[PDB]
Amino acid sequence: IKQGIREVILCKDQDGKIGLRLKSIDNGIFVQLVQANSPASLVGLRFGDQVLQINGENCAGWSSDKAHKVLKQAFGEKITMTIRDRPFERTITMHKDSTGHVGFIFKNGKITSIVKDSSAARNGLLTEHNICEINGQNVIGLKDSQIADILSTSGTVVTITIMPAFIFEHIIKRMAPSIMKSLMDHTIPEV
Fold first, then answer.
1. What is the CATH superfamily name and number for domain 5-84?
2. What CATH number labels 90-183?
3. Which segments within 36-167 are labelled E, that is strand?
4. I need a surface site. Which of 29, 52, 89, 127 has the fewest CB within 10 A?
């Protein structure tokens, strides 16, 4: 989480798409979905990012519909956005033990217990938090088995980006679970 505001410059693809769904939260506008291989992914937009401005208009108070309409009408060539980096999220750094464990139990992406005497305990991991990302990879809507796969295959250092469940459940509301698994960008970014 870059405790910072940043400018991104987007470019609608061949099909007039940017690969983004947006959600009204507490009179702000947040990223609900970033489509794999879209302009939004290539420029590095993330789930939970806040959109402060779109072509220099402020987003405060906008409906999800108005933000989507606004994107639908931009003159294609160049869209500037002002982003605040995942403001509802925090990063926690943990170390596997000899057994390969960081030291929690999660269900449907949501941490439900912290194992006594673990790296997860020592680092103050919380329950009732959804897993958004692991070592910078978005895991939102992957099966629980595939999130364990990624944790297993990670190096002894594991970085987990988490979000309070209430806020998580508010953001993904009215997005069908298949769209999350199918189309939410789960790739490592390209350099």
1. PDZ domain (2.30.42.10)
2. 2.30.42.10
3. 50-54, 57-58, 79-84, 90-95, 104-107, 110-114, 129-134, 137-138, 157-164
4. 127
DSSP for 11-58, written as a single string: ---TTS---EEEEEETTEEEEEEEBTTSHHHHTT--TT-EEEEETTEE
Residues 6+ apart with CB under 8 A from 123: 92, 93, 94
- Cα–Cα dist 70/57, whole Å: 10
> Do 5-84 and 90-183 show the same overall fold?
yes
Q: Which residues pair with 130 in a beta bridge?
A: 110, 163
| Residues 33, 186: Cα–Cα separation, whole Å | 11
Bridge-partner residues for 54, per DSSP? Answer: 57, 81
* Residue 27: partners with Cβ closer than 8 Å, 6 or more residues away: 60, 61
Domain extents for the chain? 5-84, 90-183
Resolution (A): 2.0
Binding residues: 108, 143-144
